[PDB]
Design a binder for this molecule. Structure first.
Ligand SMILES: CCCCCCCCCCCCCCCCCC(=O)OC[C@H](COP(=O)([O-])OCC(O)COP(=O)([O-])OC[C@@H](COC(=O)CCCCCCCCCCCCCCCCC)OC(=O)CCCCCCCCCCCCCCCCC)OC(=O)CCCCCCCCCCCCCCCCC
Ligand SMILES: CCCCCCCCCCCCCCCCCC(=O)OC[C@H](COP(=O)([O-])OCC[N+](C)(C)C)OC(=O)CCCCCCCCCCCCCCCCC
Ligand SMILES: CCCCCCCCCCCCCCCCCC(=O)OC[C@H](COP(=O)(O)OCCN)OC(=O)CCCCCCCCCCCCCCCCC
Ligand SMILES: CCCCCCCCCCCCCCCCCC(=O)OC[C@H](COP(=O)(O)OCCN)OC(=O)CCCCCCCCCCCCCCCCC
Ligand SMILES: CCCCCCCCCCCCCCCCCC(=O)OC[C@H](COP(=O)(O)OCCN)OC(=O)CCCCCCCCCCCCCCCCC
Ligand SMILES: CCCCCCCCCCCCCCCCCC(=O)OC[C@H](COP(=O)(O)OCCN)OC(=O)CCCCCCCCCCCCCCCCC
Ligand SMILES: CCCCCCCCCCCCO[C@@H]1O[C@H](CO)[C@@H](O[C@H]2O[C@H](CO)[C@@H](O)[C@H](O)[C@H]2O)[C@H](O)[C@H]1O
Ligand SMILES: N=C(N)NC(=N)NCCc1ccc(I)c(Cl)c1
Ligand code: SF4
Ligand code: SF4
Ligand code: SF4
Lengths: 56, 176, 69, 307, 225, 154, 145
């Protein structure tokens, strides 16, 4: 993302593609490396009644 | 559903035949290949400046093992041997006895780091978060023997890395 | 970046510039500041050998003009 | 004075070869989205020196004939340096009336180093690999000689500095770009360069090593210098000869860099396929273009001067 | 007929040559035989799971999936739907990992070394997805009988989307190097032709079948997850 | 005397560690992380470590994967054909000591039963970065060598 | 022209590293003359920099101290020299540095980080940590056959 406009034009022409739209190096679009804590759901057997193991 | 990768009929009109003749004689597709490698020459390379820069890792990373403590300094391990039982490589060897104060503690805790497959099963199995795979991966040695960890080495790893280990557990324990 | 390839190219280019530049300046030094005489055919060698005798010092590149007439 | 001149050619050739290994690695690296040498000296500028010292203090690891085991690298390196002494840059070290023939004659001898080292390998399989390499080299010698003759029918002589005069107004690549194309590819195949690097390919399917490597990389530079003179003639100003040397060096560098560019871009030929490229494609066209370039000066009344 | 004793791992090929032509190929394998099948008999079903990462060690999570499905079938249980989608998601990421290794090292072996470098930087980014869900770049041991070991970390799916958004251009660059290259076609066109009937009788599968026109893909005919 | 021997040692050490040409024995999965070390992110070539060298031009053997009994003789033969100075890097649990297959009937319990090993890189597999750390550790081992100083004192 | 702005960007890196000597020092120690924002420094002298305009992986780096634990590290740097509290940040295991999110303190955590000690007299040597299992009978010390 630091290439001069001339070099950007040069490599786009040589490749035939708009390379700047799909750079293979990652910048700020990637997710933060610190995330809020999750709160994961529980499965269908997490019940207080009508849940005898012999029926599942 | 399917598609044909290579089932097409070349057009046999004079214009198309002459187009293929020009490609054969003027090497057009070969020149088009030169353009691709030329465009890469002028792209920023993907190389990082190791060891001044490091590849990104996550809190789940499975690296060098360590034995952890409670905040008071007491060992977490209570010699249950669940880690030893689950170890797919049989890399763990444990012996235990009552401590002088009656605590259930190990007298031997060895990990053969050259048997270990760094799978993380031991730290899944542990009920007290005693054995963990820490974040360190830069511990290559000059001799085979240095990779046969006894309990003193593993407790030293825990004391050395606990600051990072605790923070990584803090980030991931809600997924566990 | 790609322009970090240049320093190695610069050294290579200077190494290839030296032979041609050295030959040209050595020729001028050895031939009185002129181009080294080319003699591919007997006629040119004959004139060069006549120049050597006419020079008075046995140097084909030392030229005598109307001052010697 | 002359011995100084010889050394001001021999020494820079070896230094240029040393730093071509760095340029090749870095150019290939950047075309591969990486850097290549950049730790051993700034921008890798000490990498050739470290490699050179390393190779020469390495264990020099039985030959089937000691005389030929030593002859082969001396021949390779001695011949490679010899190919430079008639090159006009713009003035040659030795001004030969038949300089083009001399280069053709000396280059035809280079195949003996391949043959002799195969004999000295003392291994049935290395001798067979050498014979396959020789067959490739002599095959592409055929088109190189015929292409060169075709070009000289526009120049008028076998003197290398006459090519400069012939291209005073215009590069010979314009009237002879079909020959330039086959000439360029022929040099790649002649130097066993990718996609014609079948000796290193087929093979994997210290000081003496370094010496053969220097000979090959000196030949690579020399062939591209020859190509620049043959088809991209630089104008010579007798009062400012350094102007010629700068422009002609840039062209030779770019031609050499395009050898690396091509290595980075294509897969390898099969042996039989690179033989067909020569005998069934290049040679037919080269023969037809040789007849054409014999006729053309006559039919246009553009015959060059003998001198 | 000259005999050549030598001509992914390490292979020993013993070949009979008549000039340039191959008259016999005798692969001698076992150089990486490690008695995995016998070792598995001394492991619990969970302890055996990591052995499958180390078989086709380019397609780790697909080997895990096959073993997990087999155990799930004998257990008579069903993994939950989110686990099934994760398994398909990482099954196809794993297919990208494998096909990059397959195609570019195939190219690298016959002299075309450059796409290997471009596409292995894409492999490096998929190794990060492996490491983020499992903590390991390669031998994740992530897919297990019953589902997967852990849920995806928050933010992973966004980064997979960013990677996928750009990947087809990287395939295009690979195709520009090889697909129409006459040298590449000279090395591959009409090489190793296998008939549809021969492929079936010799026990071929996958692309070794479909390349010969057979319309067969287990994901379509015998689907799972 | 001392100064010349020391400086000359520094020179030859610097050349040898700055131009380490590896022969990689890509036996199994550890070979994949070795390829990733050559790949653009780490670019081992930028350290002077060429991608693939011929065994007779090699200075370091990287054993990257499980060494089986059937393969052991061939590996020793390659090691013996290496020109000196030669070093061995053992990569990953399998080569280090057998790893997951330590108890197999067909597996050598560590490549150090066959060849002397200079550096042991742990992990199953070690990450490409871990392997690079190991290669740099080997470079530092070479920097510590004092061949000429010991020769002078014989 | 753009090539002009590039050239002045190169010059700014010289003054950004405190002159020519500092510029050459970082060039030869680290083969990199980029100028980043100083994130912090640890007790051993390692300095940590960031530049979020660089692509992911090059946006954080450490300039290692020239001396750690009595070892001259002007040329001999090592990845194991990064202490654990900065290890998490430098490897992007987290977003915030220990200067903003310090680690929890424990009395048993090492106050002094140690780098890899392999090949030194401080290297680890394995041994059995258990006591003797079988006690041998000791004969009496007086003659009495
Ligand atoms: C051919 C060579 C032409 C010379 C001019 C090159 C140049 O300046 O371009 C760089 C400049 C930046 O390139 P970019 O990739 O677009 O930007 C990346 C970053 O922005 C880059 O900027 P940044 O933001 O990343 O800032 C960092 C950088 C800022 O970058 C710089 O300071 C530029 C340094 C380049 C100087 C090159 C001097 C050229 C000397 C010619 C002799 C060498 C050849 C022989 O600062 C540095 O690190 C300086 C380090 C110095 C490196 C060594 C440079 C000297 C090499 C010569 C050694 C001689 C001894 O490019 C341009 O401005 C476009 C015009 C350049 C000419 C392009 C022609 C391409 C060839 C045509 C196709 C033919 C293919 C066959
Ligand atoms: C023919 C003469 C060739 C002289 C080569 C001189 C090499 C210069 C050099 O040593 O590089 C600096 C090197 C640089 O040190 P380095 O090799 O430890 O590099 C450290 C920087 N990183 C971490 C990036 C690798 O200096 C030395 O290593 C000290 C030994 C000097 C060796 C030369 C002795 C003469
Ligand atoms: C008015 C009167 C006019 C009279 C004169 C008329 C003459 C001009 C018109 C005719 C034009 C002639 C063109 C001559 C060029 C040679 C053409 C040629 O030989 O190409 C064919 C060859 C094989 O082609 P292939 O597809 O494999 O199969 C064909 C046979 N089965 O394919 C090849 O050779 C491929 C080459 C493989 C090498 C690949 C690496 C090179 C790629 C980069 C090349 C860059 C260009 C070189 C420029 C050099 C500059 C000095
Ligand atoms: C392989 C080893 C390398 C062998 C080298 C072969 C030498 C062939 C040189 C012939 C080139 C040539 O023709 O010119 C050299 C010179 C005549 O110069 P020339 O310009 O052609 O004509 C006279 C001036 N117009 O002619 C001379 O200078 C005379 C040299 C005679 C001695 C050569 C003996 C070579 C023996 C090699 C064994
Ligand atoms: C299709 C890709 C195939 C790849 C093949 C590799 C091609 C590399 C070709 C390199 C040569 C490119 C030309 C470089 C020019 C260097 C600067 C220069 O010399 O400019 C001068 C030139 C006109 O001057 P001059 O060369 O003297 O022509 C007068 C006739 N004697 O100015 C004219 O420009
Ligand atoms: C610009 C064109 C515009 C279009 C209009 C032009 C009209 C005027 C031109 C008329 C010329 C027509 C001549 C064409 C004859 C070609 C005959 C032919 O097709 O031969 C091919 C065949 C060899 O092919 P092969 O690979 O062995 O077998 C095929 C299996 N795949 O059979 C063969 O064995 C090859 C033939 C024998 C080899 C002869 C080689 C030619 C001689 C070399 C020098 C060239 C001619 C003189 C110079
Ligand atoms: C380009 C100019 C370079 C000038 C550099 C001048 C330096 C002169 C001192 C060279 C010291 C070389 O150091 C030595 O090289 C030889 C190369 O085979 C190595 O190998 C040698 O020793 C080993 C045993 O150790 C032998 O089995 C082997 O047959 C022998 O070749 C040595 O292991 C290395 O210690
Ligand atoms: N093929 C490459 N470009 N790289 C490479 N490893 N070349 C060979 C290295 C080499 C050989 C001889 C000498 I003298 C020098 Cl200085 C360097
Ligand atoms: S990581 Fe796996 S192989 Fe290593 S000790 Fe733990 S359970 Fe055993
Ligand atoms: S480390 Fe954990 S699982 Fe292993 S014996 Fe100790 S308490 Fe039990
Ligand atoms: S150590 Fe692990 S990754 Fe390496 S070869 Fe053995 S099983 Fe595969």
């Amino acid at each position: 993302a630091s290439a001069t406009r001339f070099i950007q034009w040069l490599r786009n022409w040589a490749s035939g593609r708009d390379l700047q739209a799909k750079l293979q190096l990652r910048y700020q679009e990637i997710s933060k490396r610190t995330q809020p804590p999750p709160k994961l759901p529980v499965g269908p057997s997490h019940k207080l009644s009508n849940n005898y193991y012999c029926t599942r | 559903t399917y598609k044909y990768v290579n089932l097409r009929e070349p057009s046999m009109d004079m214009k198309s035949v002459t187009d293929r003749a020009a490609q054969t004689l003027l090497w057009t597709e070969l020149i088009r290949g030169l353009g691709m490698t030329l465009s890469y020459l002028f792209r920023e390379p993907a190389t990082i400046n190791y060891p001044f820069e490091k590849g990104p890792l996550s809190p789940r990373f499975r690296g060098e093992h360590a034995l952890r403590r409670y905040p008071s300094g007491e060992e977490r391990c209570i010699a249950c041997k669940l880690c030893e039982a689950v170890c797919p490589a049989q890399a763990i060897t444990i012996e235990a006895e009552p401590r002088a104060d009656g605590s259930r503690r190990t007298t031997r805790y060895d990990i053969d780091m050259t048997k270990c497959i760094y799978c993380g099963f031991c730290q899944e199995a542990c009920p007290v978060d005693a054995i963990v795979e820490g974040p360190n991966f830069e511990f290559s040695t000059e001799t085979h023997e240095e990779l046969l960890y006894n309990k003193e080495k593993l407790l030293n790893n825990g004391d050395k890395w606990e600051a990072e280990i605790a923070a990584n557990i803090q980030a991931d324990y809600l997924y566990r | 970046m790609w322009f970090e390839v240049l320093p190695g190219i610069a050294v290579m280019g200077v190494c290839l510039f030296i032979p041609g530049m050295a030959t040209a300046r050595i020729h001028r030094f050895s031939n009185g500041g002129k181009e080294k005489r080319v003699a591919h055919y007997p006629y040119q060698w004959y004139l060069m050998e006549r120049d050597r005798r006419v020079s008075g010092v046995n140097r084909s590149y030392v030229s005598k003009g109307l001052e010697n007439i | 004075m002359f011995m100084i001149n010889i050394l001001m050619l021999i020494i820079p050739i070896l230094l240029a070869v040393a730093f071509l290994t760095l340029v090749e690695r870095k150019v290939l690296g950047y075309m591969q989205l990486r850097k290549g040498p950049n730790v051993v000296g700034p921008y890798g500028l000490l990498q050739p020196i470290a490699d050179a010292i390393k190779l020469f203090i390495k264990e020099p690891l039985a030959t089937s004939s000691a005389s030929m085991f030593i002859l082969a690298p001396i021949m390779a390196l001695g011949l490679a340096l010899t190919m430079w002494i008639p090159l006009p840059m713009p003035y040659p070290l030795i001004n030969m009336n038949l300089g083009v023939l001399f280069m053709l004659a000396m280059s035809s001898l280079a195949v003996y180093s391949i043959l002799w080292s195969g004999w000295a390998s003392n291994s049935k399989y290395a001798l067979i690999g050498a014979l396959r390499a020789v067959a490739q080299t002599i095959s592409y010698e055929v088109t190189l000689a015929i292409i060169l003759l075709s070009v000289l029918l526009m120049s008028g002589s076998f003197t290398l500095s006459t090519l400069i005069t012939t291209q005073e107004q215009m590069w010979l690549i314009l009237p002879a770009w079909p020959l330039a194309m086959m000439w360029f590819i022929s040099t790649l195949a002649e130097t066993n360069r990718a996609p014609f690097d079948l000796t290193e390919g087929e093979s994997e399917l210290a000081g003496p090593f370094a010496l053969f490597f220097m000979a090959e990389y000196a030949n690579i530079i020399m062939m591209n210098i020859f190509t620049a003179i043959l088809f991209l003639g630089t104008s010579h100003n007798p009062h400012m000869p350094e102007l010629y040397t700068i422009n002609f060096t840039i062209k030779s560098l770019l031609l050499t860099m395009s050898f690396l560019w091509i290595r980075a871009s294509y897969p390898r030929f099969r042996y039989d396929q690179l033989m067909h490229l020569l005998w069934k494609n290049f040679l037919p066209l080269t023969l037809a273009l040789c007849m054409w370039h014999v006729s053309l000066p006559i039919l246009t009344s553009g015959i060059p001067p003998q001198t | 007929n000259l005999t050549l004793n030598f001509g992914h791992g390490v292979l020993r090929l013993v070949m009979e040559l008549s000039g340039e032509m191959v008259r016999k190929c005798d692969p001698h394998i076992g150089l990486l035989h490690r008695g995995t099948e016998k070792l598995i008999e001394y492991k619990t079903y969970l302890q055996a799971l990591p052995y499958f990462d180390r078989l086709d060690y380019v397609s780790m999570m697909c080997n895990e999936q096959a073993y997990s499905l087999a155990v799930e079938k004998l257990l008579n249980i069903r993994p939950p739907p989110r686990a099934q989608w994760i398994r398909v998601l990482f099954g196809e990421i794993t297919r990208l990992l494998n096909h990059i290794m397959a195609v570019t090292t195939h190219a690298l072996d016959i002299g075309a070394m450059t796409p290997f470098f471009w596409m292995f930087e894409e492999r490096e980014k998929m190794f990060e997805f492996y490491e983020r869900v499992s903590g390991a770049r390669m031998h994740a041991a992530y897919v297990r009988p019953g589902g997967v070991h852990q849920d995806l970390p928050l933010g992973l799916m966004d980064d997979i989307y960013e990677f996928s958004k750009n990947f087809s251009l990287r395939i295009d660059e690979l195709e520009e190097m090889l697909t129409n290259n006459r040298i590449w076609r000279n090395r591959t066109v009409d090489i190793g032709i296998v008939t549809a009937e021969d492929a079936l009788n010799y026990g071929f599968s996958g692309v070794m079948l479909r390349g010969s026109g057979i319309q067969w893909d287990l994901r379509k005919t015998q689907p799972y997850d | 005397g001392e100064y010349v021997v020391a400086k000359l040692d520094d020179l030859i050490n610097w050349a040898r560690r700055s131009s380490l040409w590896p022969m990689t024995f890509g036996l199994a999965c550890c070979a994949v992380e070795m390829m990733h070390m050559a790949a653009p992110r780490y670019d081992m070539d930028r350290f002077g470590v060429v991608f693939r060298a011929s065994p007779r031009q090699s200075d370091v053997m990287i054993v990257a994967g499980t060494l089986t009994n059937k393969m052991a003789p061939a590996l020793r033969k390659v090691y013996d054909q290496m020109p000196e100075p030669r070093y061995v890097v053992s990569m990953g649990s399998c080569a280090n000591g057998g790893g997951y297959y330590h108890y197999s009937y067909s597996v050598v319990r560590g490549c150090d039963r066959i060849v002397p090993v200079d550096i042991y890189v742990p992990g199953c597999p070690p990450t490409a970065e871990a392997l690079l750390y190991g290669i740099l550790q080997l470079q530092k081992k070479i920097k510590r060598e004092k061949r000429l100083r010991i020769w002078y004192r014989r | 022209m753009e090539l002009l702005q590039v050239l002045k960007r190169g010059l700014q890196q010289v003054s950004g590293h405190g002159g020519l000597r500092g510029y050459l020092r970082v060039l030869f120690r680290a083969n990199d003359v980029r100028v980043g924002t100083l994130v912090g420094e640890d007790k051993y002298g390692n300095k940590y920099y960031e530049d979020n305009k660089q692509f992911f992986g090059r946006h954080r780096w450490v300039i290692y101290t020239t001396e750690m634990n009595g070892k001259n590290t002007f040329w001999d740097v090592d990845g194991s020299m990064v202490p654990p509290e900065w290890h998490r940040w430098l490897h992007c295991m987290t977003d915030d540095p220990p200067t903003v999110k310090p680690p929890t303190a424990r009395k048993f955590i090492w106050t002094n980080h140690k780098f890899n000690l392999s090949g030194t007299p401080q290297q680890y040597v394995p041994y059995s940590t258990t006591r003797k299992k079988i006690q041998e009978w000791v004969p009496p010390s007086t003659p009495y056959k």
